[PDB]
């Protein structure tokens, strides 16, 4: 019923009204530690040893990505892995090719037969097909794919989080909030990460991604199909952006404003747009504001444009044809908005 507000789940309410310190006391130091632990080298080595024989004359490289690597993971987080077999890094696949699916199918048997791996699930129908498998010596669940784009946006998030740590604290908070609100079926960890990034861009605390991707005599694009996946690694001092120390008061204030902002955002006409990094980016206008490679890509592939006829539009800042919240329904959006409203209220000072 659209005339009634969806009540914030008690599990979320107890954590919000509870101290924000308890939300980080343990979570931030764990997340920081998990950016680099020796277990990941063991996983990398075991994965290469396992898979090389199946692809004998081909280069093979493992790329770690996802929340562990960016610094918002916890001990139960998966480890996301991109296996590059035969220099596919720079090849864009909107949906996986038959050749990609064949390689993933071949990889399945290796994990099945190995004593060191428990095959959990082989997901073939997804946008990004993945093999979910537990590395038994470490106990870490690995999510293995053949698509480089997540690794690319992981390196962007890592730069953002390291340059402006407030961002990372906020993402740890909002990730946990999403879980306690039971919103993860429609809004992913990565979606809410992009929302935090966009919010802070509007506070002049983060640069637009477009500004990091100027193509001139000094800087050339790394391309994955039509997408520019590199970025200038400028100091924030050179960018002219201040770098805050995240304290509990500071985080609490930015979080209240975050939820207040997305509580009142006009999802019918505007999109969350970390590429442009400015306020009030119109759904009606975004496609004309993108780089010429986008226009050329869609002109040749009109079925592959960003999906804008959706309740909630959050555009990936690198894979510009991807609305990462395209699965949010009308009622799921109302639920999100209602939860944001109630959360910002509980974060007010007296
Ligand atoms: O490289 C990736 C990409 C995505 N994912 C994660 O896989 C999960 C499922 O991905 P989606 O949320 O996109 O839903 P889906 O499987 O039905 O595929 P589409 O609707 O987009 O067509 C999501 O939680 C995503 O974050 C990865 O783990 N690795
Ligand atoms: O829509 C999507 C979803 C996911 N991804 C890419 O897949 C990465 C892994 O997608 P995950 O679903 O594993 O999320 P996450 O690792 O960021 O956080 P967890 O819930 O696992 O702790 C994401 O961090 C992103 O790089 C996309 O590129 N697009
Ligand atoms: Mg992950």
Author numbering: 201 to 550
Which sentences from the paper describe this structure?
Terminal uridylyl transferase (TUTase) is one type of enzyme that modifies RNA molecules by facilitating the post-transcriptional addition of uridyl ribonucleotides to their 3′ ends. Recent researches have reported that Drosophila TUTase, Tailor, exhibits an intrinsic preference for RNA substrates ending in 3′G, distinguishing it from any other known TUTases. Through this unique feature, Tailor plays a crucial role as the repressor in the biogenesis pathway of splicing-derived mirtron pre-miRNAs. The structure of Tailor contains two canonical globular domains separated by a large catalytic groove, which serves to accommodate the 3′ ends of the target RNAs for the post-transcriptional addition of uridyl ribonucleotides.
In this research, we determined the high-resolution crystal structures of Drosophila Tailor-C, and its complexes with UTP and three short RNA stretches (5′-AGU-3′, 5′-AGUU-3′ and 5′-UUUU-3′) using X-ray crystallography. In all these structures, RNA stretches exhibit a very similar binding mode for Tailor, lying along the canonical catalytic groove formed between the CAT and CD of Tailor with the terminal 3′Us anchored into the pocket at the bottom of the groove which is usually occupied by UTP or its analogue in previously reported structures. This is further confirmed by our structure of Tailor-UTP in which UTP can be perfectly superimposed with the terminal 3′Us in Tailor-AGU and Tailor-AGUU and maintains conserved interactions with surrounding residues. Three conserved catalytic aspartic acid residues (Asp278, Asp280 and Asp 343) sit closely with their side chains all pointing outward from the other side towards the groove.
